[PDB]
Structures are given as structure tokens and as C-alpha cells.
Amino acid sequence: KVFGRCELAAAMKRHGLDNYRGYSLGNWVCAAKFESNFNTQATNRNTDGSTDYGILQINSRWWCNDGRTPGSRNLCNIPCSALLSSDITASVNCAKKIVSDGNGMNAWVAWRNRCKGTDVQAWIRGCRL
Ligand SMILES: [Cl-]
Ligand SMILES: [Cl-]
Ligand SMILES: [Cl-]
Ligand SMILES: [Cl-]
Ligand SMILES: [Cl-]
Ligand SMILES: [Cl-]
Ligand SMILES: [Cl-]
Ligand SMILES: [Cl-]
Ligand code: NA
């Protein structure tokens, strides 16, 4: 499913991301825009053989099992295909574990390079929330 900007903002708020670990909603909507263009079915292969999955591009090296990343962990306890669903519940639950791991939202390279330090409130303007 490809989300609209305000539809995804609403769904993230409902699942408790808004100010989660100090990050306002606009930070999460900005990261999803630059990681996947709001498409729950996005995948991308990395040079080490791992793959990133779903609206927040979560990586199979640490976080999920895809049966093809030898010697990796599965810290979220889920198959990576669960992260491609139109229901974002699995992605959001796993993102809360990643952001808690010590490096905050710096875990997402697009957030650090394109959202960090910008006016992120802009991503939720005009939305009914
Ligand atoms: Cl947009
Ligand atoms: Cl915000
Ligand atoms: Cl594996
Ligand atoms: Cl393969
Ligand atoms: Cl593990
Ligand atoms: Cl599996
Ligand atoms: Cl949802
Ligand atoms: Cl932090
Ligand atoms: Na894995």
C-alpha cells in the first residue's frame, strides 16, 4: 500500500510514535518519506548481502529473519516479510526497539541526512490529528 502523508501521520500517532523517546511525529513521517516514499512494499539489497524492508527500511542483519543473511540476528523476532504488510503494526513495534538501542533515529541514514535539523513540523501541517 502507498500511504498519503496525513493518512500515515494518523496511523503513526495511533500506534504511539508521537514523541516516542523524544521524537515528534514529523520526524517519523519525514524518515518514512525518504526511506520508502511511503510504500509498505519497498525493498533494497545492501553490499554485505543484507536487505532493508518496508516503510522504514528495517535491516535483516540485526532485526528480522529473511532466510538469506547468514550469521545475522533477529532482534524483533519476526520474519522480514511481516514488515511489508499494509498494516504497519509490525514495522512500528520493531522501530520502537531500534530507536531505543542507543543511537536514537541516527539508525536511519536518510533521517540523519535529510530530516535531522530541518523544520520537521512541515510534514504534519494541514493534517487533522
Ligand atoms: Cl508528500
Ligand atoms: Cl513534528
Ligand atoms: Cl538468515
Ligand atoms: Cl535469494
Ligand atoms: Cl537474535
Ligand atoms: Cl521466518
Ligand atoms: Cl495501519
Ligand atoms: Cl535520542
Ligand atoms: Na536476520
Side-chain angles (χ1 to χ4, degrees):
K1 175 176 182 183
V2 177
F3 276 82
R5 171 177 69 87
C6 299
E7 185 182 13
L8 178 64
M12 280 174 163
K13 188 171 169 164
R14 188 188 131 225
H15 280 102
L17 255 11
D18 157 62
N19 287 302
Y20 192 84
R21 278 271 159 144
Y23 291 95
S24 71
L25 199 57
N27 286 282
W28 299 101
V29 175
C30 187
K33 170 74 186 173
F34 297 126
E35 290 290 349
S36 64
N37 206 30
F38 300 148
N39 183 3
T40 62
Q41 298 194 70
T43 58
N44 284 292
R45 187 95 197 252
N46 306 125
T47 54
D48 69 5
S50 64
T51 299
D52 294 342
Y53 287 90
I55 41 151
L56 292 165
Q57 289 292 274
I58 290 172
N59 184 259
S60 61
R61 227 231 74 124
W62 308 94
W63 304 107
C64 63
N65 177 56
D66 66 2
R68 63 162 205 201
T69 312
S72 63
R73 330 268 306 282
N74 177 9
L75 290 167
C76 289
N77 294 309
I78 47 164
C80 297
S81 62
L83 303 176
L84 304 178
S85 183
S86 53
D87 176 343
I88 65 176
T89 304
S91 282
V92 165
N93 288 350
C94 186
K96 288 183 181 161
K97 193 147 341 198
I98 295 166
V99 75
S100 295
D101 202 41
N103 297 315
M105 280 194 78
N106 300 293
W108 287 276
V109 184
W111 181 81
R112 192 168 46 76
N113 291 331
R114 305 179 74 178
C115 300
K116 194 177 188 174
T118 72
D119 182 20
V120 298
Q121 191 282 132
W123 291 99
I124 60 167
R125 164 173 322 144
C127 305
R128 196 171 183 97
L129 304 163

